[PDB]
């Protein structure tokens, strides 16, 4: 018996992405088995595994780790730190019954690389952001450790950073804003240090999207300067409630609209809009003239790092008469069925926060994106997709890291997105490349095979 | 761009197969390009005919060296894939600093056997010829059963031919890897034997990457073949015995009359590929008989007119894949063996030339998948197989209402399908080869 142990990152999004690649690995090598270790959050996994076939399910096991006690920005980090001993024991126990081919860790979970080192087991990272961001975050840690450049000092409008694999200088203004906090800067640098200790890094991208970055990693690996990096994506989650029923209503409305005529606006799992920003969007949407599906959520009260909620009364928040005047032009919704909308033939553009899964989803369906970065590494993602790759346009977002984007600037971005024609052509060609990369013979298909072959040595 | 250069061997069973694995490799990794160098006889795949000048191959060494050097100009020469008969080019690859590989189109068991014969004749001075006796048994790595000296290929009787074959086996050991047209579940003990030997740094890596099969303009043999398939469409499932003897097999009149007696007495439905040896030496294609009604027993074609069909060259894979076909009297060439297994058609063995006597031994005695017809050796010329022995072989093939060998063949057939699909043994073995090539 030969086992890979997965420790997914927090959230059903990260669980789902991890289980998609777990299924892929099991289908690509019948000798492989997988055990998934899930970590409880003190506030079901088998459901998200796409297989329905006993040739595959007989080879995967799911274990929930024993819940643990302990007394913020480091909340999830602390829970995973309390679970290291449980992971170590679970992994040690499994290795009594199997050849332990490796511990596969979500990039958030790389504190567990220590556990693999202590047991003498190979470690691998499942890196769920872009290859370019892997290069950027590693280079920031390297500058800080080897050249004494503390990251806070680079976070300036007059600073440019030479990132391996990038033609364009990377502005210090797109360093993720959380690096200004010294505790969090050190945590992220330490993640990057741990990446370098592993036996290989799976990245959710395809090499034709990020070819110069992937070449830079290939060179570094050949010089023993970095682990092997495997571009194996796009790994996407493409397959009762009333939020699911409002989703069918939107799709039904989308069915009656003309092809590529609807602008979709959606801002990820933690994004939200304050009332004044929402009113500026509304004004811009009404003035733009294009059909729209607008996912609109309010920030959680008493908790900026809580999950966003829906607006109780959108009629009191939005401009007077907006919903009446736009009743046949567009729809406003809460949580959205995003992939169904992006894959719908009526959808013509995507105003996106540029989270990496939203970026890959829009690329997969060939929908051009107008960028509106908000948190995490979204500002860098918008720079890579816009300035470096030329696949996206910006939504007049000069502010990069409490400044509102005016209706004039939003309408200017929608005009570029929908009125340009050259970018849409580049997005369609890249979309075709994304579909072929994961098919037989494609770059991500063969890179996944190469990873499996390394693992099975 | 990364190039693999193939030098295939002669004959349908060697050349068609090399083109199939070249096509498979090109489909399986788009980073790959393939050039095929064709040795004459007396979007990403390229064919080169080498200029015309057994020892055919050695006169071509310099043309091969030069074509390979010229390709190495606009591409990364990942390696040279050679047929088992072309491995004199291992020197060319060595001289040019390029990895060499063998694409071995016979069984892994035969790879072990021919390598062991070379090992015995290299240490001990005794020639292989002195083992080709009825009271000789050979311990071949990977075989539970001792291998009779009777099934050493007959060509080993010639001192010069045996030495050249030993030279081939010696050169296999010098390559970077041997790809074999088999799947590990078919020959698992042999493949374990190679894995042990490679791990002890005693043999190149051996990749079981098959079955590699040729399943695929208007012609007259195309037309007769189409007639056969239409006739098969009208027969009950597993009701027809197919008889076919490879690209060089043929039947003399007395042997053909014994087959005709057996078929008429057995009462089974049949498709019988009947060809006579070319008067122009066995180094040319067999041909149909003229006026077959004057060759076969009197009235045979009249009495069997609704029971079966006699043809020349046959659409073999189409017949083996047809649901009416229930059994295959076969010369046990390795491609025929793989094709019949793929379609789950049990074989009754009638070895004739090359390594077929060994293949029949491996499939029958060692693996239990085939049934034997008679007991002739690799060096017995002209011994007629009686109608009675043929009848008994066909009874075992078609009977049981019994069906125990058919059950093993069906289960082995399913294993052959799975081995080359996503995740199977041969799928991942080919990936390991592709990885080595791309490294
Ligand atoms: O209303 C929404 C918002 C987001 N998503 C999905 O949630 C994920 C968002 O991930 P991304 O990496 O883009 O951003 P994050 O949530 O990590 O900031 C994607 O799969 C979206 O399709 C969704 O289905 N509905
Ligand atoms: O009448 C015939 C005889 C042979 N074959 C094909 O020729 C090949 C024979 O290869 P094998 O290795 O069995 O024997 P060989 O020709 O090398 O003796 C196989 O692909 C058969 O399907 C065919 O199509 N029709």
Strand B206-208 versus strand B178-180 pairing type:
parallel
Q: At what angle do helices A356-364 and A421-437 cross, to 10 degrees?
A: 90
Chain A residues with CB within 8 Å of chain B CB = 26-31, 440-443, 446, 449-450, 452-453, 456
User: Residue A317: left if φ>0, alpha if ψ -120 to 50, beta else—which one?
Assistant: alpha
Ligand 1 pocket, residue A358 CB under 6 Å? yes
3-state secondary structure of B302: helix
Count Cβ atoms within 10 A of the Cβ of residue B216 and give its class: 0-12 exposed, 13-18 middle, 19 or more buried: exposed
Distances (CA, A) of A357 to A13, A101, A207: 9, 28, 16
Q: How many helices (H) and strands (E) does chain B have?
A: 15, 15
Task: With beta carbons less than 8 A apart as the criterion, state whether A292 and A283 touch.
Answer: no
| Tokens at A337, concatenated | 């069925």
Under DSSP, the state recorded for B423 is: B
End-to-end CA distance of chain B: 13
**B2-7 vs A392-394, strand pairing mode:** unpaired
C-alpha to C-alpha distance for A340 and A352, rounded to whole angstroms: 15
**How far apart, in whole angstroms, are the C-alpha atoms of residue B138 and residue B118?**
13
Distance, CA of B106 to CA of B74 (rounded, Å): 33
The CATH topology of domain A242-435 is: Rossmann fold (3.40.50)
Exposed e or buried b per residue across B183-201, where buried means at least 16 C-beta atoms within 10 angstroms of its C-beta = bbbbbbbbbebbeebeeee
Of A249, A431, A417, A234, the C-alpha closest to A336 is: A249
CB A46 within 8 Å of CB A19? no
Q: What distance in Å separates the CA atoms of residue B136 and residue B140, rounded to the nearest whole number?
A: 13
Query: Angle at CA A219, nearest 5°, toward B178 and B33?
Result: 40
Are the Cβ atoms of A27 and B422 closer than 8 angstroms? yes
Compute the distance between CA of residue B433 and CA of residue B437 in angstroms, rounded to an integer: 6
Q: Do B428 and A453 touch (CB under 8 A)?
A: yes
Q: Tell how far the Cα of A204 is from the centroid of ligand 1, in angstroms.
A: 15
Burial of A88 (0-12, 13-18, 19+ CB in 10 A): middle
Cβ atoms B74, B62 nearer than 8 A = no
Residues 6+ apart with CB under 8 A from A72: A78, A305
Q: Using the 8-state DSSP alphabet, how is residue A233 labeled?
A: -
Cα→Cα distances B377→A189, B148, B276, Å: 74, 9, 22
A336 is in an annotated binding site: yes
Residue B273 CA to residue B108 CA, distance in Å, equals 28
Residues in chain A preceding a C-to-N separation beyond 2.5 angstroms (breaks): 43, 71, 239, 401, 419
Contact A31, A2 (CB under 8 A): yes
* Beta-carbon-side half-sphere exposure of residue B68 (alpha carbons within 13 Å): 28
Short-list A331, A211, A218, A177, CA closest to A266: A331
d(CA B12, CA B9): 9
- Classify residue B142 as left (phi > 0), alpha (psi -120 to 50) or beta: left
Give the pair of three-digit tokens for residue B365: 């005695």
Instruction: Classify residue B150 by burial, with Cβ atoms within 10 Å: 0-12, 13-18, 19+.
Output: buried
Instruction: For residue B20, count other CB atoms closer than 10 A to its CB.
Output: 18
Quickly count: other Cβ atoms within 10 Å of residue A240's Cβ.
Answer: 5
Axis-axis angle for helices B404-420, B425-438 (nearest 10):
30
CA A308 – ligand 1 centroid, Å: 13
Cα A4 to Cα A91: distance, rounded to the nearest angstrom: 10
At residue B341, what are phi and psi to the nearest 5 degrees?
A: -65, -45
A276 closest CA partner among A118, A397, A402, A424: A402
List residues of chain B with CB under 8 Å from any CB of chain A. 26-31, 422-425, 428, 431-432, 434-435, 438
Map B318-340 to HEC letters.
Answer: HHHCCCCEEEEEECCCHHHHHHH
The domain A2-237+436-456 having CATH identifier 3.30.70.2970: the answer here is no
Resolution (in Å) of the shown entry?
Answer: 1.9
The minimal CB distance from A28 to the residues B423, B434, B438 is found for B423
Q: How many other C-beta atoms lie within 10 A of the C-beta of residue B55?
A: 8
Give the count of alpha carbons within 13 A of B232, CB side only: 26
Helix/strand/coil for B188: helix
Using DSSP's 3-state secondary structure scheme, residue A46 falls into: helix
Of all protein residues, the one whose alpha carbon is nearest to atom 9 of ligand 2 is: B246
Q: Which residues pair with A29 in a beta bridge?
A: B423
Beta strand pairing call for A170-171 and A160-161: antiparallel
d(CA A449, CA A457): 12
CA–CA separation, A104 and A300 (whole Å): 33
- Name the 3-class secondary structure at A101: strand
Tell me the CB-side half-sphere exposure of residue B181, using CA atoms within 13 A: 29
Asked whether the beta carbons of A151 and A140 are under 8 A apart, the reply is yes
Q: How many CB pairs under 8 A join A and B?
A: 41
DSSP calls for A402-420: --PPPHHHHHHHHHHHH--
Nearest atom (ligand 1) to Cα of A339: 22
Which string of b and e fits A186-209 if b means at least 16 CB within 10 Å?
A: eebbebbebbeebbbbbbbbbbbb
Q: Where are the alpha helices (DSSP H) in B36-80?
A: 61-71
Using an 8 Å Cβ cutoff, are B360 and B340 in contact? no
Residue B311 three-state SS: strand
CA A285, A289, A294: angle at the middle one, nearest 5? 35
Nearest in space to A417 (alpha carbons), one of A221, A262, A204: A262
User: Å from B72 to nearest chain A CA?
Assistant: 22
CATH class of the region B220-416: alpha beta
A311: alpha, beta or left, given left = phi > 0 and alpha = psi -120 to 50?
beta
Which residue is listed with tokens 């075992």? B396
The residue assigned the tokens 């950027």 is A136
Question: What CA–CA distance (Å, rounded) separates A286 from A327?
Answer: 11
- For residue B105, the ligand closest to its alpha carbon is 2
Distance of CA B57 to the CA centre of its chain: 21
What separation in Å is there between the alpha carbon of A358 and the centre of ligand 1?
6
Q: Do the beta carbons of residue B31 and residue A446 sit within 8 Å? A: yes
Q: Report the SS3 class of residue B412.
A: helix
Q: How many angstroms separate the CA of residue B402 from the nearest CA in chain A? A: 31
Asked if A226 and A196 touch (Cβ cutoff 8 Å), the reply is yes
Burial of A392 (0-12, 13-18, 19+ CB in 10 A): buried
Three-state SS across B100-160? EEEEECCCHHHHHHHHHHHHHHHHCCCCHHHHCCCCCEECCCCCCCCEEHHHCCHHHHCHH
Identical fold, A2-237+436-456 and A242-435? yes
Q: How far is A441 from chain B (nearest CA, A)?
A: 4
Give the other-Cβ count within 10 Å of B338's Cβ.
Answer: 22
CB A18 within 8 A of CB A9: yes
From the candidates B22, B429, B431, B439, which should be mutated to test the interface with A, based on the most A CB atoms within 10 A?
A: B431
Is position A338 annotated in a ligand binding site?
yes
| Ligand located closest to A235 CA | 1
Measured CA to CA, the distance from residue B328 to residue A16 in angstroms comes to 50
Q: What is the CA radius of gyration of chain B?
A: 22
Sign of the Cα pseudo-torsion (A295, A299, A305, A308, in order)? negative
Q: Which of B297, B269, B220 is nearest to B397 (CA)?
A: B269
Token couple for A245:
């029923």
CATH tag, B2-214+417-438 = 3.40.50.2000
Q: What is the DSSP string of A313-334?
A: -HHHHSPTTHHHHTTTTEEEES
- What are B343's two structure tokens? 């379609």
Handedness of CA B417, B422, B425, B429 (dihedral sign): positive
Contact yes or no for A336/A295 (Cβ under 8 A): yes
Longest dimension (CA), chain B: 67
> How far, in Å, are A173, A177, A194, A314, B264 from residue A180 at the CA level?
11, 6, 21, 35, 93
List C-alpha distances in Å: A97 to A26, A65, A94, A100: 19, 18, 6, 9
CB contact under 8 A, B435 and A449: yes
A440 and A28 in contact (C-beta within 8 Å)? no
- Strand, coil or helix: what is A352? strand
- C-alpha closest to that of B105 among B221, B198, B39, B11: B11
Indicate the angle between helix axes B404-420 and B334-342, nearest 10 degrees: 90
Q: How was this structure determined?
A: X-ray
Query: How many CB atoms sit inside 10 A of residue A421's CB?
Result: 6
DSSP A123-181: EEEEE-S-HHHHHHHHHHHHHHHHS---HHHH-STT-EE--TT-SSPEEGGGS-GGGGS
Using an 8 Å Cβ cutoff, are A109 and A80 in contact? yes
What are the E-state strand segments in B183-307? 206-208, 240-244, 269-273
Transcribe B342-406 into DSSP letters. HTT--EEE---STTHHHHHHIIIIITS--EE-----TT--SPPPPHHHHHHHHHHHH----THHH
What letter does residue B313 receive in the DSSP assignment? Answer: S
Q: Is the peptide bond before A234 cis (omega within 30 degrees of 0)?
A: yes
> Where do the domains of chain B lie?
2-214+417-438, 220-416
Cα within 13 Å of Cα(B339), Cβ side: 28
Cα atoms in the Cβ-side hemisphere of radius 13 Å centred on B288: 13
The chain A residue lying nearest B419, using CA atoms, is A30
Which residues lie below 8 Å from residue B345, measured CB to CB, with a gap of 6+?
B242, B320, B325, B326, B327, B328, B409
Give the burial class of A71: count Cβ atoms within 10 A of its Cβ; 0-12 exposed, 13-18 middle, 19 or more buried: exposed
Closest Cα in chain B, distance from residue A435 (Å): 14
DSSP lists the bridge partners of residue B148 as B137
| Among the listed residues A340, A382, A379, the one whose alpha carbon sits nearest the alpha carbon of residue A359 | A382
Q: How far apart are CA A427 and CA A363, in angstroms?
A: 7
H or E element: which one contains A357? helix A356-364
- Asked if A453's CB is within 8 angstroms of B30's CB, the reply is no
In this complex, do B424 and A28 lie within 8 Å of one another by their Cβ atoms? no
Residue with tokens 């240090």: A193
């Amino acid at each position: 018996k030969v086992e890979l142990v997965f420790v997914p990152g927090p959230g059903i999004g990260h669980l789902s992405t991890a289980l998609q690649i777990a299924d892929l690995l099991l289908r690509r090598d019948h000798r492989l088995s997988v055990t998934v270790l899930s970590i409880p959050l003190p506030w079901q996994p088998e459901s998200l595994f796409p297989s329905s076939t006993t040739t595959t399910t007989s080879r995967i096991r799911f274990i929930s780790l024993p819940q643990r006690p302990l007394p913020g920005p480091f909340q999830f980090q602390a829970v995973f730190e309390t679970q290291k001993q449980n992971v170590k024991e679970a992994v040690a126990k499994l290795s009594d019954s199997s050849i332990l081919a490796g511990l596969v860790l979500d990039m958030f979970c790389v504190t567990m690389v220590d556990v693999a080192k202590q047991l003498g087991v190979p470690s691998y990272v499942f890196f769920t952001s872009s290859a370019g961001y892997l290069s950027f975050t590693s280079h920031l840690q390297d500058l800080s450790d080897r050249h004494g450049k503390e990251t806070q000092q680079l976070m300036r409008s007059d600073v440019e950073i030479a990132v391996p694999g990038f033609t364009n200088p990377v502005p210090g203004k797109v360093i993720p804003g959380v690096y200004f906090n010294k505790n969090m800067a050190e945590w992220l640098h330490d993640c990057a240090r741990r990446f370098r200790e592993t036996n290989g890094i799976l990245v959710n991208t395809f090499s034709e999207l990020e070819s110069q970055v992937m070449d830079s990693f290939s060179d570094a690996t050949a010089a023993s300067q970095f682990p092997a990096v495997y571009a194996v994506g796009p790994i996407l989650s493409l397959n009762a409630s009333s939020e699911s029923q409002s989703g069918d209503e939107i799709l039904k409305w989308l069915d009656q609209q003309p092809p590529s005529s609807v602008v979709f606006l959606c801002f990820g799992s933690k994004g939200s809009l304050n009332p004044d920003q929402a009113r500026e969007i509304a004004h811009a949407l009404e003035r733009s003239g294009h059909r729209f599906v607008w996912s609109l959520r309010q920030p959680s009260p008493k908790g900026k790092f809580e999950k966003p909620i829906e607006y109780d009364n959108i009629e009191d928040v939005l401009p007077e008469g907006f919903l009446d005047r736009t009743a046949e032009m567009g729809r406003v919704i809460g949580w959205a069925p995003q992939v169904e909308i992006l894959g719908h033939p009526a959808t013509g553009g995507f105003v996106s926060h540029c989270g990496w899964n939203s970026t890959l989803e829009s690329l997969w369906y060939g929908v051009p994106i107008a960028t509106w970065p908000m948190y995490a590494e979204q500002h860098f993602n918008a720079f890579e997709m816009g300035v470096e790759l030329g696949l996206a346009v910006g939504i007049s977002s000069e502010s990069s890291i409490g400044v509102i984007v005016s209706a004039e600037k939003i309408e200017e971005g929608i005009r570029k997105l929908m009125g340009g024609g050259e970018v849409r052509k580049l997005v369609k060609a890249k979309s075709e490349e994304s579909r072929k990369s994961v098919m037989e013979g494609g770059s991500s298909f063969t890179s996944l095979n190469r990873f499996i072959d390394e693992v099975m040595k």
